[PDB]
């Protein structure tokens, strides 16, 4: 396994993101060398209406 576990909650660390210092469920993780593999899903929508986004390994950290 390369990254966090399925169904595990993680905290985001992108300064650009609407979900920054916020928590979301890990939907999936790809192990094929992609730059932004970690797929995360949040309950709260962003300004557009999207509730998912692919984040990186360094950009996510353990909850709270």
């Amino acid at each position: 396994e390369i990254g966090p576990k399925r169904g595990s909650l993680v905290k985001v660390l992108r300064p650009e993101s609407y979900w920054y210092n916020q928590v979301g469920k890990v939907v999936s993780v790809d192990q094929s060398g992609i730059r932004y593999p970690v797929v995360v899903r949040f309950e709260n929508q962003n300004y557009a209406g999207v509730s998912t986004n692919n984040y990186a390994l360094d950009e996510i950290e353990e909850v709270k």
Partner: protein, 163 residues
């Protein structure tokens, strides 16, 4: 007295304003008959007006040169010269009510968010829960300092920032 203001009892313009406002009704009362309902309505307004003026004078209010009562805000002068009921005491009568509304809404928000689908609980309220909290908030200042001294009031850098 203070600030060059006379009490409302001793003022002349204050009584002048009373004789004026009653003269308007007496002229208006001449048109109708004694036992009619318009007569009873105006006589009551006359009775209320006579009661409004004497009660404001009895309460140690301060009337200016214009003849209207003025209020004092500093608690020092209010307590020294016996004018506390004007501003200083109602300040605590409000804040008790205002914090009541915050302590109640804050608790309904926290408790509904501990369950599934909190969005539905806002548009479709849980009235049994809302009434429960609304009758449990009589002592909200106790819970606040309890929650402040404990540290479970504020969140700690788990909030979104922008840069």
């Amino acid at each position: 007295d203070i600030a060059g203001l006379t009490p409302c009892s001793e003022s002349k313009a204050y009584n002048k304003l009373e004789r004026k406002e009653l003269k308007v009704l007496d002229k208006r009362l001449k048109q109708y008959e004694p036992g009619s309902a318009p007569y009873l309505a105006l006589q009551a307004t006359k009775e209320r007006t006579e009661n409004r003026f004497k009660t404001y004078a009895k309460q140690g209010l301060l009337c200016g040169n214009d003849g209207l009562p003025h209020l004092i805000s500093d608690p020092g002068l209010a307590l020294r010269f016996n004018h506390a009921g004007e501003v200083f005491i109602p300040t605590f009568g409000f804040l008790y009510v205002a914090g009541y509304i915050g302590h109640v809404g804050r608790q309904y928000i926290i408790l509904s968010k501990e369950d599934a689908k909190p969005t539905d609980k806002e548009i479709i309220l849980d009235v049994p829960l809302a009434l429960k909290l609304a009758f449990q908030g009589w002592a909200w200042p106790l819970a606040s300092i309890q929650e402040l001294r404990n540290g479970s009031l504020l969140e700690k850098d788990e909030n979104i920032t922008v840069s």
